[PDB]
Design a protein around this nucleic acid. Structure first.
Lengths: 317, 125, 55
RNA sequence: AAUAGUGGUGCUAGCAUUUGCUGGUUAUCCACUUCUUAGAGGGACUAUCGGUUUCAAGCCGAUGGAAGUUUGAGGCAAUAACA
């Protein structure tokens, strides 16, 4: 009837905090995982309710905290954005990266890849946005903000490549701007968040844009009408966001647990809240990054004490 | 063997008063922040200044401040029901609708001459 | 900097040491290392009602 | 980076020899920076949890960490009778 999520595993391979996990659309058997501890870790999803087996590779190439990792659909390559103005073009088999980047003055905060595999966007903490080639060449800088930037997202162009690519950004000046690539221009200005914008993701259809900051203001947006349909108050601090790829469930990663919603109507199914031991109660660990399956049937959640737990989407009884 | 000098102590609470919504309980973020909003000459002095603000900032999640704090301006204005009772403690309904007073104080109300539903008891000593 | 006397009064090896004001330095540092200065930040918009706009 | 060094290609001697392990030196030539040197930056803040105290300044454990005795050691800092 409903999506209950029982505990299916636990990963222990880090000593920072995780910063971005990454699944492959093609390959359902691995997991890319990045963390604060200057490491990149690619996993092996050995389906077992005692553990999940092998972190098959490690990538020792950086000097500080990395922020977000991205990859191809089949699992061909991997990218990394570490705080020391560095970007690396990794393989997935050996560990040998390709080319570092010289393009910023700050932490490179968020990057993304087009599915046509031609341009790589980059937004960094020095209030500028940069695009890169596959061989790694500068094309155009982009300005417009005045505070920092947190996340940048490319639109899911599921309309059979009808020259429709656009970049949406999560700044830090309580501002959400939309940036074209084909014409290289501001597209839409999104207004309404009152504090530091923390995260944004759009629908897997590329149609419904969710945005939520520090106060817990989940403000929904459309792709074309681009309006404030739902303005949910998450009454907490949310760090990252979550969209079910196949279904219509939008989820949020608050500091007080894990909350889930349906698109229509409003169904608070579960609070994914794990269990710990040995704490004065002002010290409960909490997650910051989470990810779905390739079919939306498993959910991952990495936490501050380097535990990554997994669940499975079975029907409610 | 390590206590913090006042020039760490003083400027740590000046920074918390002008940029309080911008701060964060994690040290590694707002390490990158004080260079933006302030001018720190050395590097080790920045590392010490941002060190104790975050230690100061988790006091705020348990108690009040020795600066100013707009939780006084808003959440202590949410403390307008510290406990508002649904029926008052000063309600004569607790006293069966009749006031229980001493002997000669009943002459006080009879002096100003009012009609109140009061009862009178006996006094010792 | 070692300069002697052209005075009618007093003769022995006279010495002078010189450490000027830092507010006009233009070669290196400009303030003493104890100095800290935080900036003002500007007054705020009230509440920012949504009013989202589609360019 | 012939005013540091390894990695080969060689001329070249041993070679148990038989694939091999030690050599060979100007220039046999090419490719390298880990070790080396010096510029530019980074990194530690007592961090994170557990005790203790007017719950305050702090002090003790803990696991991480190159580093947790001001992180180790120095330089620099004027009141005064040695006529």
């Amino acid at each position: 009837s409903n999506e209950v999520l029982v505990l299916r595993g636990t990963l222990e391979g880090h000593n920072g905090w995780v910063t971005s996990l990454a699944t492959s659309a093609g390959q359902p058997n691995l997991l890319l995982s990045a963390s604060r501890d200057k490491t990149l870790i690619s996993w092996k999803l050995t389906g077992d309710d005692q553990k999940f087996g092998v972190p098959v590779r490690s990538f020792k190439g950086h000097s500080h905290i990395v922020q977000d990792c991205t990859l191809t659909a089949d699992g061909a390559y991997a990218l990394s954005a570490s705080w020391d103005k560095t970007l690396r073009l990794w393989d997935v088999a050996t560990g040998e990266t390709y080319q570092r980047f010289v393009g910023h003055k700050s932490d490179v905060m968020s990057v993304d890849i087009d599915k046509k595999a031609s341009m790589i966007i980059s937004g960094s903490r020095d209030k500028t946005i940069k695009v890169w080639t596959i061989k790694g060449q500068c094309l155009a800088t982009l300005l417009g903000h005045n505070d920092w930037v947190s996340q940048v997202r490319v639109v899911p162009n599921e309309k059979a490549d009808d020259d429709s690519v656009t970049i949406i950004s999560a700044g830090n000046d309580k501002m959400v701007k939309a940036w074209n690539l084909n014409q290289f221009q501001i597209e839409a200005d999104f207004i309404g968040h009152n504090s530091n914008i923390n995260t944004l993701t759009a629908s897997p259809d590329g149609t419904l844009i969710a945005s939520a900051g520090k106060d817990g203001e989940i403000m929904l947006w459309n792709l074309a009408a681009k309006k404030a349909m739902y303005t949910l108050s998450a009454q907490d601090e949310v760090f990252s966001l979550a969209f079910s790829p196949n279904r219509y469930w939008l989820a949020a990663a608050t500091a007080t647990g894990i909350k889930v919603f349906s698109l229509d109507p409003q169904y608070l199914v579960d609070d994914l809240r794990p269990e710990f031991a040995g704490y004065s109660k002002a010290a409960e660990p909490h997650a910051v990054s989470l990810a779905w399956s390739a079919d939306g049937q498993t959910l991952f959640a990495g936490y501050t004490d380097n535990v990554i737990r997994v669940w499975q989407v079975m029907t409610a009884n | 063997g390590r206590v913090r000098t006042k020039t760490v102590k003083r400027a740590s609470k000046a920074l918390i008063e002008r940029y309080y919504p911008k701060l964060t309980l994690d040290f590694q973020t707002n390490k990158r922040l004080c260079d933006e909003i302030a001018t720190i000459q050395s590097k080790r002095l920045r590392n010490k200044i941002a060190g104790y603000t975050t230690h100061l900032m988790k006091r705020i999640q348990k108690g009040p401040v020795r600066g100013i704090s707009f939780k006084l301006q808003e959440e202590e204005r949410e403390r307008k029901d510290q406990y508002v009772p649904e029926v008052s403690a000063l309600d004569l309904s607790r006293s069966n609708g009749v006031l229980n007073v001493d002997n000669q104080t009943s002459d006080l109300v009879k002096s100003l001459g009012l009609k109140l539903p009061l009862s009178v008891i006996n006094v010792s000593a | 900097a070692t300069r002697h006397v052209l005075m009618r009064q007093g003769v022995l090896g006279i010495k002078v040491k010189i450490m000027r004001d830092p507010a006009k330095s233009r070669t290196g540092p400009k303030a003493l290392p104890d100095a800290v200065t935080i900036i003002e930040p500007k007054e705020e918009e009230p509440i920012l009602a949504p009013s989202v706009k589609d360019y």
